[PDB]
Amino acid sequence: SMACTIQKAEALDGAHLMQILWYDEEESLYPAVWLRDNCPCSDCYLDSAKARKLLVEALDVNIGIKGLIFDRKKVYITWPDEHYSEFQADWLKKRCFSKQARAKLQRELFFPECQYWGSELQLPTLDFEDVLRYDEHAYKWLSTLKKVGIVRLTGASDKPGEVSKLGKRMGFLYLTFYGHTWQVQDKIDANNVAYTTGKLSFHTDYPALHHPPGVQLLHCIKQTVTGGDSEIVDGFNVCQKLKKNNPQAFQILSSTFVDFTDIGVDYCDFSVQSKHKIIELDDKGQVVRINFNNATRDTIFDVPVERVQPFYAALKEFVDLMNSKESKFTFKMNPGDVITFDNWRLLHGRRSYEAGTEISRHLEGAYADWDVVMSRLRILRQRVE
Amino acid sequence: SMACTIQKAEALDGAHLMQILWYDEEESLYPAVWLRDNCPCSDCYLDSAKARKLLVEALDVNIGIKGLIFDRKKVYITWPDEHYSEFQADWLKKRCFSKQARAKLQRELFFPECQYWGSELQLPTLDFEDVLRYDEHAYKWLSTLKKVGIVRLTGASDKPGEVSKLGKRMGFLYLTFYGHTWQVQDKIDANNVAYTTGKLSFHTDYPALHHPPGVQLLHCIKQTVTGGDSEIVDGFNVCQKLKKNNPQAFQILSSTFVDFTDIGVDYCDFSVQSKHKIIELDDKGQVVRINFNNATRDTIFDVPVERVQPFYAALKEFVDLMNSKESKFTFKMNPGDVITFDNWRLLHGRRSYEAGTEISRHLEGAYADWDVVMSRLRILRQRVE
Ligand SMILES: C[N+]1(C)CCC(C(=O)O)CC1
Ligand SMILES: C[N+]1(C)CCC(C(=O)O)CC1
Ligand SMILES: O=C(O)CNC(=O)C(=O)O
Ligand SMILES: O=C(O)CNC(=O)C(=O)O
Ligand code: NI
Ligand code: NI
Ligand SMILES: [Zn+2]
Ligand SMILES: [Zn+2]
């Protein structure tokens, strides 16, 4: 393309910069030190690993270009210490430091597109076996999971082992103290409120961990008619509404460290403690994770006394917003249904149901790391494209 | 004790607070809403899970105490809606909201004690089998690992499978794309610079992940005489020196998001991307993690052009400080040695060695999550005490 063809290349600014004039008449600037740092020759770069061999120690941060020649597709550079580098035009173009270029590349790397939703949610639904079998369907699955925060898979069996197949489709599951997979059912001497018939209000799973699970998989094996409906809410949407309606509540929940705890025995014996802000913001002030499970929020609360009641007042507002008819989406899982969702963004709940002699309700669940999911998503996109 | 015995209990401030006068004449304040939130009765609290059943929805954030009686060891409270609660004196005392009380409890939960070191490091060393066999030794191991950031274990075998035993002693290992465990040796078509004979400058492992491994285990199976010495540095100590010597460099490295990448095939196929600040600060400005591997730092660099060379200048200063004779500690692993260290705090390196026809050097490594390690540490402390 004209955009990726070199019309002129030259060293500028004490030879500390290279400028490319492209044939579309746009110009790009590349710091000399970055070029040297990213020399792709076999001394500096290990092709089989696609990784840098060059040490920081070898880099003169005040380096300038000693010599430069070019043709339409390549730049050829000599450095002051006689090192020699070649850079490809398309490789340079992609890495252009302009905001527009960098932003475009970031979107391609990290799939930032996000669709907020409330009670109007149309639950994205795909077939289980299709997803396992076809890359086009697995791509739709993971891309939708990232964008919308949840996908329902229908047509799985009513037997354990289904979430493990999805785990393999992704890469591998995220092991925790509750196992590689775990059975959500009523249990004698339950080590977790999830393993009872009680109502679960909106929560994220495992805030007791510093790194809570990114993605949750829940497969319905048995369902009861006496209750047990699922409820979800878009935590990012709720946070936006909270900041608007009650900035003071938002400020408290996005700045106060809450202690979470989990003690007991399952995969092995554990005694787990963490601290999270319930609304976790990035350095730009955007919400990147919600960390909230009212069951595992500790009795220990590490704040001064005067901050305690305002925190609870803020928390109540947040929960009231989640429960709003405009915010929450309700549905009931059937045997063979699997839901897969963003556990950093969505909060989920379940309605109480009745206990009985034998098991009337059974889900099998598992977790996955977002980096594992994003890796598979990147690869799938490449295969389908 | 006099400290944990109740002399007087009363409701204050519109009954929105409870005050305890202890027999040591100290006073403690407990917000009414926190008391109600943390009622330990069987309606509100699930004993078998040690978890809260009470919903945020059930909590009146403006609640006050309706009635209160007490004896030396318990408080008995009635609430406005006729709910009834009992709280134990020692339980209350521990959770006192005074800064001194909260801080003491936080130290007990999270083991914050930290000993910074440089080239004067005395490498903490324990016997491998002792650690597996005796809780007192496993406690010394993990507590020292947390405090100092590294422990050497001697007297393991010269065969694979040793780091897996330590993994079980902790609880379980942290699975990544390179496997449950992995073999550090020279490999044809290496997918990582670690799997070559090249020099590795100081780095943390796996900054290409959003959640890099907290603890690293490295077991020497075979060692070469031609090089391959290990080097470590206390990243937290180095960061302190950098902030002092070059606050501008510290500011850049603690504020600039660097892209990391890892693409290839090992446990399965992967295409991994992340962003980290090299010096990662908490909300108080204290360093909590270093994220830096020069091999996996991407060619993609998502900053404006004018920030590029100053970043490299800052990075060079940081690396130069790490390499200072006062900072780094050098040693050579022997067959049967295992080092276990804090991969969020320490940076580690290895000297190049010579390639040859058969394998002259072989380490087996694995990772563990700090939450898994801290859990085991908490349990061990309880067993030994
Ligand atoms: C599967 N299981 C029990 C893991 C821990 C979650 C939590 O307690 O936050 C609930 C669900
Ligand atoms: C074991 N292995 C290969 C995992 C990835 C680390 C990294 O590339 O940061 C190097 C060490
Ligand atoms: O039982 C359900 O429907 C939901 N269960 C959970 O969210 C859980 O295990 O924490
Ligand atoms: O080979 C060594 O001694 C150290 N290896 C590593 O730090 C690695 O695998 O990244
Ligand atoms: Ni849950
Ligand atoms: Ni390493
Ligand atoms: Zn080169
Ligand atoms: Zn109660």
Residue numbers in the entry:
A (entry chain A), B (entry chain A): 0 to 384
List sentences quoted exactly from the publication behind this structure.
Recently, we reported that the ferrous iron and 2-oxoglutarate (2OG) dependent oxygenase γ-butyrobetaine hydroxylase (BBOX) can accept substrates other than γ-butyrobetaine (GBB), and in some cases catalyzes unusual oxidative rearrangements. We report that BBOX can catalyze the oxidative desymmetrization of achiral N,N-dialkyl piperidine carboxylic acids to give products with two or three stereogenic centers.
The screen led to the identification of N,N-dimethyl-piperidine-4-carboxylic acid acid as a potential human BBOX substrate. At the active site, the piperidine ring of N,N-dimethyl-piperidine-4-carboxylic acid (1) is bound in a chair conformation, with its carboxylate group in the equatorial position. This result is consistent with the preferred conformation of 1 as determined by solution-phase NMR analysis. In the BBOX 1 NOG NiII complex, the equatorial H3 (pro-R) atom of 1 also points towards the metal, in an orientation consistent with its abstraction in the catalytic cycle to give (3R)-hydroxy-(4S)-N,N-dimethyl-piperidine-4-carboxylic acid (2). Kinetic analysis revealed a KM value of 40 μm and a kcat value of 0.14 μm s−1 when using 1 as the BBOX substrate, compared to values of 4 μm and 0.83 μm s−1 for GBB. The results for the BBOX-catalyzed oxidation of N,N-dimethyl-piperidine-4-carboxylic acid demonstrate the potential of BBOX for the desymmetrization of cyclic achiral compounds to produce a product with two stereocenters.
